[PDB]
Structure 1
Amino acid sequence: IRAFTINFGPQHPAAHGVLRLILELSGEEIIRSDPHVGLLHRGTEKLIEYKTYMQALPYFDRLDYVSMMTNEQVFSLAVEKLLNVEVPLRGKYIRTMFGEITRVLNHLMSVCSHAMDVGALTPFLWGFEEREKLMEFYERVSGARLHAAYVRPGGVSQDLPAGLLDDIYMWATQFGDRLDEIEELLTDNRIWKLRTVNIGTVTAQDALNLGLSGPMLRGSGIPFDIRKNAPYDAYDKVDFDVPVGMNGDCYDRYLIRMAEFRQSLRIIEQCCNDMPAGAVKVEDFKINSPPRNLMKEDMEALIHHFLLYTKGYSVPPGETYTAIEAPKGEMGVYVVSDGSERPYKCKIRAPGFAHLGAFDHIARGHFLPDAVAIIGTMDLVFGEVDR
């Protein structure tokens, strides 16, 4: 009476994610779907109420583990909006262009992982290679790789090395060749064009009713981006085109991701030319640490260095919802300050949460291999959706 309904993936159906996903197939046609998420659900929100904002920061590079830095950024932005502080100029640009090399990383993982999920093996290695080149650029700034103990709610953890700003330009000249190269065997590509021409149409008002955002909403045709609609972090001060798709297909959702490499490289060209000088952390020693040069010399710097690492910094009461444009979509965060130094509550709006929630409105009628091309362009990394 019901279809012979299946379990899609216990372990390794879609790479980078545990996609348990009920499908009811009637002609190898999905009449309805029901993805059970919860398989990664660590319960992080219950934890982040018991730690200080000081300590609460590397919860979030665990969240959305392919684009750590936007999560870091959005929580730093929520707290800076909450604290009524202002990150300095150098801090604004350095956070901006790290949030754009992370965009390069995110689309470089996501497009190539989706091509592997479809079956194209060559970008799945050609992209992860340049991702290793970017692992190096996370490595020189902050800690190890893939989980940066970086942007603090006071701004930036620390300065660059002495020569990363040079070295990244040597990388940035050759990323264009290495990007157009993978563009050359997927964009025209009658196999890919066949598999992705009208697959999973997303109309405009239904894109709004499903709460979707980022490259998907911009693929449906609506020109909406937080970098340019409600700007911040000198995205005002950096010239930046935005791509907008035409149909509601997955092919616009592909082509916009191909375009954002070309855009976010132009970010780096306008950033590395015009990186200013100035204090990389916030100016005061009352929301982040003093530098370790002068705390061994000054009496005043010690008590700040101690209270920020025992109590932490005190936050005014209130609540904020700061949402910024993650490369997955609009990622939001809703923090409710006690007035204490632990956050009384903090919801995340993971971007892929509504993308997964909008699955079986899009996935009806399509085929089961067509039920894979729909997966990795709504980008269910599953670190996001449950938490």
Structure 2
Amino acid sequence: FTLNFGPQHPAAHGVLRLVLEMNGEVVERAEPHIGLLHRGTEKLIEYKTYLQALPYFDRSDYVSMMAQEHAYSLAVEKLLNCEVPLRAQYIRVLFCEITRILNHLLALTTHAMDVGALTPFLWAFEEREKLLEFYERVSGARMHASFIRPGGVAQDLPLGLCRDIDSFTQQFASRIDELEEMLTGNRIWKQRLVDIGTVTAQQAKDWGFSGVMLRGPGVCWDLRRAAPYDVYDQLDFDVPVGTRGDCYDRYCIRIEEMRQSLRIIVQCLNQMPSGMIKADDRKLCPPSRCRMKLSMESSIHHFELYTEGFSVPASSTYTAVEAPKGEFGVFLVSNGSNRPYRCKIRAPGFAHLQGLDFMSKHHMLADVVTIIGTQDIVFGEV
């Protein structure tokens, strides 16, 4: 018995087009259909410079924007050998972590709105509209902040942003507590989530989950502890790791990972060195407006970096960061030219949404939206 389970609530899971082969109410197999959001991203990037390539990444995962620009930047610094300053690293993490918070605040309470709890959605989205007052203030666009450029980061924080991020972090433990007091204790929540989509660790490894769905099963594997790719080796934070694997562990993790991300934000705030914002290598970082206008040699680079590009040397690397969805890695083959060459984007949600087939076997049809909830399936990456 085949059922074309589509997007239950649009605007939350946009193009979800599962084709469930059911058995009464018990689902026997879930066959997701991809491509409804397949923009030509892995082709369009081959046609544009390494700078023009960056805006696609904030548009790859639309609920955790800067994590993908941070995964791309670290793939055009893996090749460029472009050492970025300490302040660029600290800002880059303070925003990758603000993005982890922006994602878990959505991927928890959009999940909690698919399950049925209507209010956590709107509380978490007031919180997200506080964090977009930081995105929009530091770069310009509330969602797609093309801000974490290859060398360092686009431009320094405004002169009042750390004070505001602090005044937000002080009041954010309470918001997590409310999102938690409203959902963690509920017997209507546990019942809707405990023993739902349980993934034994061998399955989370096999299906390349590598995210909050690889730390549910108990595999202690965070690419901020495994492969520290910034000040992360300096910052202190504990990676919460589940013990059962059910969608109630992944929720409890995403609601603790939203507190450890608060620890990382507070650290990045309390220790942010007053250094240069971009790599001093002005052939990888366009010089400031003031310098390119006054200096002829800076003007030449501002011209050959906003038209030509880097021309990062010939290589091929797989740089993977811990994006909120999971291990978002961008395999970036680079022909010597200024344009990338098959900038393949390993995006979790392409490996997670595979897991829907075995996660939601023998679960009731109303659980198939809870699974899609805890996978944090955002179809931009799929």
Band of TM-score, shorter chain? over 0.9
> Counterpart of 2:316?
319
Match among 174, 177, 180 for residue 171 of structure 2: 174
- Of 39, 42, 45, which residue of structure 1 is paired with 2:36? 39
Q: Distance in 1 between matches of 2:33 and 2:175?
A: 38
Amino acid at match of 1:94: I
Contact map agreement 1:198 1:251 (CA 8 A) in 2: yes
Aligned-pair CA distance for 1:203: 0.5
Q: How far is the alpha carbon of 1:209 from its aligned partner?
A: 0.8
Structure-1 separation of matches of 2:276 and 2:286: 13
**Residues 17, 383 of structure 1: 8 Å contact kept:** no
Q: Which residue of 2 aligns with 1:55?
A: 52
Contact 2:82 2:284 in 1 (8 A): no
The equivalent position to 1:337 in structure 2, one of 334, 341, 362, is 334
Find the counterpart in structure 2 of residue 164 from structure 1.
Answer: 161
Does 1:359 pair with 2:367? no
Is the aligned partner of 1:93 residue 2:90? Answer: yes
The answer for the alignment partner of 1:104 in structure 2 is 101
Unaligned runs of 5+ in 1: none
1:6 corresponding residue in structure 2: 3
| SS of 2:262 mapped into structure 1 | helix
1:123-144 CA-to-partner distances (Å, cap 9, x unmatched) read: 0100000100111000110022
Q: Does the aligned pair in 1 maintain the 2:17–2:34 contact within 8 Å?
A: yes
Note if contact 2:82-2:281 (Cα within 8 Å) is conserved in structure 1: no
Q: Which amino acid counterpart does residue 190 of structure 2 have in structure 1? A: K
Report the 3-state secondary structure (helix = DSSP H, G, I; strand = E; otherwise coil) of the residue aligned with 1:351: coil
**Equivalent in 258, 283, 288 of residue 285 of structure 2:** 288
Contact 2:7 2:14 (C-alpha < 8 Å) held by counterparts: no
Matched-pair contact (CA < 8 Å) for 1:334–1:346: yes
Q: Deviations over 1:204-255 (max 9, x none)?
A: 1111111111111101011000001111211111111110100121111110
1:297 Cα deviation from its structure 2 partner: 1.5
CA shift, 1:177, in A, is 1.2
The answer to whether 1:209 aligns with 2:209 is no
Aligned mates of 1:220, 1:10 — CA distance in 2: 27
- 2:133 corresponds to: 136
Q: Which residue of 2 aligns with 1:67?
A: 64
- Contact (CA 8 Å) 2:87, 2:277: kept in 1 or not? yes
Partner of 2:112: 115
Distance 2:291 2:212 in 1: 46
* Residue 369 in structure 1 maps to residue 366 in structure 2: yes
Normalised by the size of structure 2, how large is the TM-score? Answer: 0.98
Q: Please state whether the residue corresponding to 2:214 is helix, strand or coil.
A: helix
Structure 1 position 44, deviation (Å): 1.2
Shift of residue 13 of structure 1? 5.2
Q: Which residue of 2 aligns with 1:246?
A: 243
1:145 to 126, 142, 146: 142
Does the 8 Å CA contact 1:219/1:252 hold for their aligned counterparts? Answer: yes
Q: Which range moved further: 102-111 or 10-19?
A: 10-19
| Unmatched segments (≥5 aa) in structure 2 | none
**Superposed displacement of residue 16, structure 1:** 3.4
Q: Which letter does structure 1 place at the counterpart of 2:321?
A: I
Runs of 4+ deviating beyond 2 Å:
10-14
> Which residue is equivalent to 1:154?
151
1:308 counterpart = 2:305: yes
Please tell me the residue identity of whatever aligns with 1:136.
Answer: E
Normalised to the residue count of structure 1, the TM-score between the two structures is 0.97
Provide, for residues 295-342 of structure 1, a one-character-per-residue CA deviation record: whole Å limited to 9, x for no partner. Answer: 221111111111112211221101000111111111111111110011
Give the letter for the 2:51 counterpart: M
Q: Which amino acid aligns with 1:248?
A: G
State the 1:27 CA deviation: 2.1
Residue identity opposite 2:47 in structure 1: Y
Query: What's the counterpart of residue 194 of structure 1?
Result: 191
Aligned length: 382
